[PDB]
């Protein structure tokens, strides 16, 4: 019945004013990409930064099991696009937000499927 809730711990730590996880690996790129959230190569547009995926995954970075039942990681081995306004906390961003399964953009940060 007991499993550590790392996501909730980070969220609470953040809301209490804790410094976000640092040393997420930001990539150099053209910033002329598609803007989709999680891609096989950096896809930042003008309003995003692209990061190495593993370095932005709370579970990878904390050395804890992934919630996935098979333990698969959504980010490791890929690149995650973060809005430049949120790039101070890529781990918080990926953990709090969701990718649209239709268009591949972040819900509320690129997804226009509600229009």
């Amino acid at each position: 019945a007991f499993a550590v809730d790392a996501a909730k711990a980070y969220k609470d730590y953040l809301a209490s004013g804790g410094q976000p996880i640092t040393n997420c690996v930001k990539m150099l790129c053209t910033h002329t990409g598609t803007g989709q959230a999680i891609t096989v190569t950096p896809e930042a547009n003008m309003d995003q930064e692209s990061f190495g995926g593993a370095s932005c995954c709370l579970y990878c970075r904390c050395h804890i099991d992934h919630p996935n039942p098979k333990g698969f990681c959504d980010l490791k081995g890929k690149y995650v696009q973060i809005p430049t306004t949120c790039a101070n906390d890529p781990v918080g961003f990926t953990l709090k937000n969701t990718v649209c399964t239709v268009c591949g953009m972040w819900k509320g940060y690129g997804c226009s499927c509600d229009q």
């Binding site: 040393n23 690996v25 990539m27 150099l28 790129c29 096989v40 190569t41 190495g52 593993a54």
Partner: protein, 301 residues
């Protein structure tokens, strides 16, 4: 010069041809730092410039390419160089990385341990090493050829680098090995490349381009390192991050270089010529299987 707009500077051939004695390395712009683009780590910048330079060589780039990256961890527990290599290499390239210390990585598989424990069943198309021990930076001691991981790397290249493959091995004034330089003469071409972002360090990448499995040139490594230091001592390199701002041509082009499994007796001068041009890779095309030896100890009493 216009060198500031390149990703870095490669050792001019005339320096390779000298017979210098080894001297201490004194870099005029020592201590200067390049101004990195906002939020970019040194090692992302350094690996980007290394890959920008490798784009100018005749690397073989097959389907099902296999790359292994030693010294991939950082004191921060992430792998910036692996992240750049995976960005640079064609999608689907198998990428394995490794380090003494635990780190989290975007590689397809990661082995934690001394590189000497690492074994692989398959051969590799590209070997990258950023392995370094900062204890070698002792200016109070004589600067002799180092063994340790360099002994491993020499043997690993001769045993597991596909003919046609390439390597980039980080060296410095004090972190170097004579046999590794001698092994550069077993490639169709070689150089020592200094990134422009780190030009105030004696660091270089020793690049072997298109492995031939036999000496094309006989290189005396003690002299070649002396030649490398003489070059660095007399050719200040202007710190520059200029090339980081042009990423449009960065990805390594998937050339689909042919892979062939040949026995020794079949490598004629025609094969050697194709290998030399980056047009052929010789190895089996089997599964990629790796392991790390683990020493077992029970310290209970």
């Amino acid at each position: 010069s216009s060198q500031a707009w390149q990703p870095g500077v490669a050792m001019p051939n005339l320096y390779k041809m000298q017979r210098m004695l080894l001297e201490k390395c004194d870099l005029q712009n020592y201590g200067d730092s390049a101004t990195l683009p906002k939020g970019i780590m040194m090692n992302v910048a350094k690996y980007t410039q290394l890959c920008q330079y490798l784009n100018t060589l005749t690397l073989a780039v097959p389907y099902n390419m296999r790359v292994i990256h030693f010294g991939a961890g950082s004191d921060k527990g992430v792998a910036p160089g692996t992240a750049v290599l995976r960005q640079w290499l064609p999608t689907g390239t198998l990428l394995v990385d490794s380090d003494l210390n635990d780190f989290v990585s975007d590689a397809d598989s990661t082995l934690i341990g001394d590189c000497a424990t690492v074994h692989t069943a398959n051969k590799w198309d590209l070997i990258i090493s950023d392995m370094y021990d900062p204890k070698t930076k002792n200016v109070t001691k004589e600067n002799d050829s180092k063994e340790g991981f360099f002994t491993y790397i020499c043997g690993f290249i001769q045993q597991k680098l596909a003919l046609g493959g390439s390597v980039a091995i980080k060296i410095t004034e004090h972190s170097w090995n004579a046999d590794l330089y001698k092994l550069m003469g077993h490639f169709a071409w070689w150089t020592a490349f200094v990134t422009n972002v780190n030009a105030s360090s004696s660091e270089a990448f020793l690049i072997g381009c298109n492995y031939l499995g036999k000496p094309r040139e006989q290189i005396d490594g003690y002299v070649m390192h002396a030649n490398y230091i003489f070059w660095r001592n007399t050719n200040p390199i202007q710190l520059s991050s200029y090339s980081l701002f042009d990423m449009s041509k960065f990805p390594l082009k998937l050339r689909g270089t042919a892979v062939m499994s040949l026995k020794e007796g079949q490598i004629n001068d025609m094969i050697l010529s194709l290998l030399s041009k980056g047009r052929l890779i010789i190895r089996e095309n089997n599964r990629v299987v790796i392991s790390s030896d683990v020493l077992v100890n029970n310290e209970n009493l």
